[PDB]
Amino acid sequence: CTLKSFTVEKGIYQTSNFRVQPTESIVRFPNITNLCPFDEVFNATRFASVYAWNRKRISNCVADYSVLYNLAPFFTFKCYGVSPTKLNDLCFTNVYADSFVIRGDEVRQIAPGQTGNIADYNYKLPDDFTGCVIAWNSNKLDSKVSGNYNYLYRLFRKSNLKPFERDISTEIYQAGNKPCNGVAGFNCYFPLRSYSFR
Amino acid sequence: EVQLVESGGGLVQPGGSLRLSCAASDFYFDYYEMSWVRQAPGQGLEWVSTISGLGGATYYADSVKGRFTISRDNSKNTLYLQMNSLRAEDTALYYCATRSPFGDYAFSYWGQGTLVTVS
Amino acid sequence: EVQLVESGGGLVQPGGSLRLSCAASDSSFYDYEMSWVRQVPGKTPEWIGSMYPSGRTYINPSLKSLVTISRDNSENMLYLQMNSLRAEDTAMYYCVSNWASGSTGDYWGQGTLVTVS
């Protein structure tokens, strides 16, 4: 079959390569069984705002990504750099969970390269962002019919926020050339305004 | 702060017409400038058209040059939007935003906005 | 070692002015945020006001011109002077320190019960 003929002449002919097949599937992962509280940032009480996003360093963990799907419908599970699945076979050194609450139409801006209002003044992701963004609607846990104004966000800032930077300052903005020197009035708009969730 | 509302239609056939009206009051409008800014479902923001208060010169977007025209009524302090030849890919929630020309590129106030879908 | 003690709890009638404040422990609680919140029974809390370290005070847009919180004592305490009482002001008021990032690093102090007849 390697010569494509039903009759072979006299001589030596190379046909294939004797490659020994594997036997076992040794893993040899580190010695870690402490299932750290990965549910403390997913199923907890009220969530952080965008200008004060909570950044929890998670190390010495057993990252079981098969526990965030049996919960409420998690949408837009977009991993940049890795696949959504096949995350249960990789050993990371230390991960960071940045938790906050945004609007429905503002979920697109949480992505490398995308710009807007939340991705430029509240939380910016770098172009080499090797992580996963996970969003889910909370209209039953973060909304009530009374007028919901317990979530703040920044609208005005001098320059664009650099990737992985938390801006919790309260310096007044100046939309014009008038030296407001801290009065919060005409052309001195407050930099942090509240949301409206009905 | 001070903020007002905008009304109009909520659905229009692909080929009809619609008259959107952003109603403002108790504001220094004649020296300010107004503009409409749309938002496609699943996309970002896009500047549709703008009018000034100083000279009243209008500026439209390159995609809506011959399909959208606006006019500000200073007697009623409202902004009109008469859309012509509505296609199927122009569905977006239009926001009514006013800003001062002697400032920065950031919108001062944002309207309520309403989504108008086309069949 | 945080044992915030509140005051102002009692029974009042519509038309008065509530001057409630929670005492902060002797420490450098500043350089971090500080706010107030109520715990009306039935649903999640409702944030009323903040006391940002810069001095700028932001108030809930719903409760505008009715509640005022200042810092013109600067010793160990805040102030909560709110007027125009109604029947729905009977809630459990708390003073949260690390708000807008809570549930992981916030310290809910004591809790007082107010009621407006």
Outline the structure in words.
The structure is cut from a larger assembly and holds chains A (198 residues), B (119 residues) and C (117 residues). By secondary structure, chain A is mostly beta strands. Chain A is 2% helix and 15% strand. A two-stranded antiparallel ribbon of chain A has the order 1-3. Chain A is elongated, with a radius of gyration of 27 Å. Chain B has 119 residues and is mostly beta strands. Helix content of chain B is 0%, strand content 47%. In chain B, the strands form two sheets. In chain B, strands 2, 4, 5, 6, 9, 10 and 11 form a seven-stranded mixed β-sheet that branches. In chain B, a hairpin with a 4-residue loop joins strand 7 and strand 8. Chain B is globular and about 40 Å long. Chain C is mainly β. Chain C has a single domain, classed as Sandwich (Immunoglobulin-like). Chain C is 0% helix and 27% strand. In chain C, the strands form four sheets. Chain C has a four-stranded antiparallel β-sheet with strand order 6-5-9-10, with no helix packed on it. A three-stranded antiparallel β-sheet of chain C has the order 3-8-7, with no helix packed on it. Chain C is globular, with a radius of gyration of 14 Å. The interface between A and C is medium-sized, with 31 and 21 residues. It is classed as viral protein. Keywords: Omicron, Spike, Nanobody, Viral protein. The state 2 complex structure of Omicron spike with Bn03 (2-up RBD, 4 nanobodies). Chain A is Spike glycoprotein. The organism of A is Severe acute respiratory syndrome coronavirus 2. Chain B is Bn03_nano2.
Brief synopsis:
The structure is cut from a larger assembly and holds chains A (198 residues), B (119 residues) and C (117 residues). With 198 residues, chain A is mainly beta.
Structural class of chain C: mainly beta
Q: Which geometry of chain C do the CA atoms define? A: globular
* Strand segment count of chain B: 11
Number of helices of chain B: 0
Task: Identify the strand order in the major beta sheet of chain C.
Answer: 6-5-9-10
Helix content of chain C: under 10%
Distance between the termini of chain C: 36 Å
Proportion in helices of chain B: under 10%
Distance between the termini of chain B: 37 Å
Computed CA radius of gyration of chain C, to the nearest angstrom: 14 Å
